[PDB]
């Protein structure tokens, strides 16, 4: 039995007194509110909020039975007796407390509306709509998963509803979520301990909702462009020779390569007993400074794996103990416990001493030539209950360990290299870990079709709640005795159209594309080159992710917000605005049914035009591609393929525009900068190319422009080939900035024509110079 007693308005926050205690309500933006119960007491700080201290002017009004605390779009309605808070966008009911905060265990209970669909929980393989499911909030490995999981590496204490709110349980501790499983109409959140707070964020659309959420939880800083390149990875290169031979293999096989990744053999010859050395094993890596320098000469970066644990058998045990860097038992000694790798402790990233000790190690190695960082096992993979961290016990801090690990490493990399963008790849974090540049992958996936088939679900679930760069170990990671060639190819094809191109697997079967048979390479080589040719498209989606939270992969359901049933789809997704991709996730599939949104669509590979008023499209399949449709009105930008993003140039642009009269107005954007400067967006050191198409019955008009202050090495003038797909055969006239130019109707591929119509392909090609001044191209019948 809970009831209202008193309220004060302090700072700009609303403090309520019930018979149970104090509740602090602070709007963190016009559409987002932090609700802290037990506000009187001392508890862990927020982990989810980018600006935990902030609060903004809200309106407070009072009636007999209710309080009303309102920002821009979001209103908290506080019923007095019984005490229950509910949330409104306009006068639309988002979410109502049931019992709300219970208190002894932390417990929160809310009503679910009938028909409400609930995405969330981070990594699970349960179906996109998680309503009717119950699962723990306890990051934990799921080695060799395939087609089912209620508990994996990276849970999120958050949901997204079909009513277009996000709800965050801002709690770091061992806990659970029950999404109307136990009780049909109840969402319950629970933890053993930790902060008793939740955050509600509203939006008018899924994009707005995501913009609002990243506003208050954190925006991912634009990664270095090289993170969009080809990674060489396995578990693991055993030697400097083997690592050099793999970089060579990429060069001799003519596959693009930006980064080679070194797994745990860089610090010792065995899987067990060396973890915590954090230093080169010189018997097998005798000249690593030279190695890394030699790779940099070929435009190739080195990334090293690190882990939370220091083994008692490692060379750094005594020193970490001496420095007070490890977590302790309640008795005050270094806590040691038996991992797979052996007996060892865990570095306490929540302490001053642990942070400084660990940071200093990353500094030294980074100075030696390491460009980027991989942090494995941050669940933490093993985390005994009575381990003590500076700010709480293992069970209290568990779900925020990797988060703070990232924060630590990020801050360190920014301080060491303020003119570079950190690369931090990790397996486990918390809500908001994207603000530390976290790039997550979906752990030790099995080498099965089921492993592949689950990757879209996982990617979208993570993407929707802040992690644009979620990806998988391409080809699969765990077990297997012999390569499943077809599955491998399918996985590396999907790879091209997902955030991070990183094949990686246990080294009894080759993970890297350069080690595959002739047929496999002949299929993947042009697709990996394609990934580089598409860097303008991807890098611009990345820019929009830094700007607004918009994920690179978007779910089908974005296409129609009034059709909740689309939420179930996890087999087709949008890569950027323009490409609807359907990965093939079983052997020998001969055709697919694609649930294309109403409109006009083109086969990306074959240029076939399709119109649909709702009905799905059947496309055939081949082994050389996977089905990808382009939306009418798309501008697809390309540059020439390079071996490494270090050699990237946009001097030459090739842009393909998919025309259809069904789209009378279309826009595209290309975001160019130096690909490395972390301040480029803030300081406007960029070149933002825009393209606007206007398509009427008798005319097709393109307006081209550039904004921003540019950057060092930016081309003043780009040679631009614009290819118009599905172009009318009736255009008599082109003018470029008012100057008339004849359109040739033959030999388009075989003269240096400025404008040429290919009648057999229905493509009109325009070649021109795109300088800093605005440009209009007008086609007319
Ligand atoms: O470091 C060895 C191995 C085990 C952990 N699953 C991660 C994986 O990426 C890594 O390759
Ligand atoms: O306008 C068009 O595209 C046509 O008529 O071909």
From Swiss-Prot:
Gene source species: Cellvibrio japonicus (strain Ueda107) (Pseudomonas fluorescens subsp. cellulosa)
Name of the encoding gene: agd31B
GO molecular function, one term: hydrolase activity, hydrolyzing O-glycosyl compounds
Catalytic-site annotation from UniProt: 376 (nucleophile), 379, 444 (proton donor)
E.C. number(s) listed in UniProt: 2.4.1.161
Domain of life: Bacteria
Keywords: Glycosyltransferase, Signal, Transferase
Family affiliation: Belongs to the glycosyl hydrolase 31 family.
Catalytic activity: Transfers the non-reducing terminal alpha-D-glucose residue from a (1->4)-alpha-D-glucan to the 4-position of a free glucose or of a glucosyl residue at the non-reducing terminus of a (1->4)-alpha-D-glucan, thus bringing about the rearrangement of oligosaccharides
Enzymatic class: transferase
GO biological process, alphabetically ordered: carbohydrate metabolic process
InterPro entries with a match to the protein in the record: DUF5110 (IPR033403), Gal_mutarotase_sf_dom (IPR011013), Glyco_hydro_31_C (IPR048395), Glyco_hydro_31_N_dom (IPR025887), Glyco_hydro_31_TIM (IPR000322), Glyco_hydro_b (IPR013780), Glycoside_hydrolase_SF (IPR017853)
Presence of the UniProt keyword Cytoplasm in the record: no
Xref: Gene3D superfamilies: Glycosidases, glycosyl hydrolase (family 31), Golgi alpha-mannosidase II
UniProt name for this protein: Oligosaccharide 4-alpha-D-glucosyltransferase
Role played: Alpha-transglucosylase that specifically transfers single glucosyl units from alpha(1->4)-glucans to the non-reducing terminal 4-OH of glucose and alpha(1->4)- and alpha(1->6)-linked glucosyl residues. Acts on amylose, amylopectin, glycogen and maltooligosaccharides, with the highest activity with maltotriose as a donor, and also accepts maltose. Does not act as a hydrolase: weak hydrolysis activity is only observed on the disaccharide maltose.
Binding of acarbose, residues: 263, 381, 427, 444, 504
Organism classification: Bacteria, Pseudomonadati, Pseudomonadota, Gammaproteobacteria, Cellvibrionales
